[PDB]
């Protein structure tokens, strides 16, 4: 997509490696925020959004939590707590066209700047001067979407780059997207290290009498820490009895 009208694939109920991403020399950058790219393989997510678009190489620095500038202002604001990867690759050999690819566009005029993920496809003539817009332009008032017009002869910062932002989400609702990491057997009544669908921890995985309602999935103590879990393969309810410790 043009960056004013960015793509959003939403990812659920599937599994992937992320090294197949971060290993590849194709990626011009692999900027990460709130997560480390190698560590993604240890995790499961409620969902991911592959928010994705083309921008010119100059603009990639704007794609951060806590940043402002033309893309962040008018096209695609990241929240100032965005969690995930911004992956970019030079696409001058893909998106640029001789005579310019004008089918890649960006906004630079609006009544006010974007809020986080505030997608906006509006086309109305913008009031860049004292005159009313009249539904027509010439001067003082103008159409709000600039075009990049990408020519393959562009200088390296003016070249197009394909961007995928992996906007991860972890909610109270349990994970549905998984890393590549292989499962193991269950081990009750022993002190063990564990990863239940992205919940990392350590304790004694006792079985329980707790009546989880059919939608209820984690149980929590007063501390807002996981007291119980329902096993994501066998659906039995386990008390995570604390790890065995005391003073000496």
């Amino acid at each position, epitope marked *: 997509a043009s960056v004013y009208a960015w793509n959003r694939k939403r990812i659920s109920n599937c599994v992937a490696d992320y090294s197949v991403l971060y290993n590849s020399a194709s990626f011009s950058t692999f900027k990460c925020y709130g997560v480390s790219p190698t560590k993604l393989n240890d995790l499961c997510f409620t969902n991911v959004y592959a928010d994705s678009f083309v921008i010119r190489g100059d603009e990639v620095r704007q794609i951060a939590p806590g940043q402002t500038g033309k893309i962040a202002d008018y096209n695609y604001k990241l929240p100032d707590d965005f969690t995930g990867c911004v992956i970019a690759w030079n696409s001058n050999n893909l998106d640029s066209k001789v005579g310019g690819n*004008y089918n890649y566009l960006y906004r630079l005029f609006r009544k006010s700047n974007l809020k986080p993920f505030e997608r906006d496809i509006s086309t109305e*003539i913008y009031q860049a001067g004292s005159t*009313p817009c009249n539904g*027509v*332009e*010439g*001067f003082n008032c*103008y*159409f709000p979407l600039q075009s990049y017009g990408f020519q393959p002869t562009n200088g390296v910062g003016y070249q197009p780059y394909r961007v995928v932002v992996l906007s991860f989400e972890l909610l109270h609702a349990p994970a549905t997207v998984c890393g590549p990491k292989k499962s193991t057997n269950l081990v009750k009544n022993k002190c063990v290290n564990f990863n239940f669908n992205g919940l990392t921890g350590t304790g004694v995985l006792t079985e329980s009498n707790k009546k989880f309602l059919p939608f209820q999935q984690f149980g929590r103590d007063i501390a807002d820490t996981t007291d119980a879990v329902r096993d994501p393969q066998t659906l039995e309810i386990l008390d995570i009895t604390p790890c065995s410790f005391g003073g000496v």
Partner: antibody
Amino acid sequence: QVQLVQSGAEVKKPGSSVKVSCKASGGTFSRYAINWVRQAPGQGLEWMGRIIPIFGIANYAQKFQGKVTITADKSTSTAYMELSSLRSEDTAVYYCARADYYYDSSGYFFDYWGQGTLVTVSS
Amino acid sequence: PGTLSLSPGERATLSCRASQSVSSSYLAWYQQKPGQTPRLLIYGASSRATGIPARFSGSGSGTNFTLTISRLEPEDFAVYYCQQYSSSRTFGQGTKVEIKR
């Protein structure tokens, strides 16, 4: 290209429409608007409408609202105008041109004019 | 249309009839051989990076934005239309230039 390939005599009767047609260079749908105008033969010229081929969205001056209907093929830059309230006294010349493209253009002015359409109407 | 007569080699200067409002830029002057397809002669106007570079100018008064044919050649003699920009795109009927006798 330059001379947009406007259809000719479009010979017609009142209480009707005609799909006037025209041609502009292949990629230009992505890089220019098409604008439309009327002229009585040997007499004054006035503006009539517009299309923005990025979306195919069109606009009209109030005299031509409902009387005119503009469309275009975004895949070829072929252009069209249904003269959607045609009359004998509407037997004027009609014109279109490549135009606009905002503060990304050098100055918004029209350049490739069409070869004209004397829509020839009588009762 | 209204008409002015001039000899070949004269310098023309004619008012935009649409200049009822001033506009923050002029657009262009379009020539026509009567009724036929118009032709762009002055362009990009209120600048001077304007028109077919052999002749012409548009900055000849800061409202009238005159058809300023720098030295009339025999093919410049025609009817003309005048157009201006400030949330605007409208045409005025210019003035015709004819060969004087």
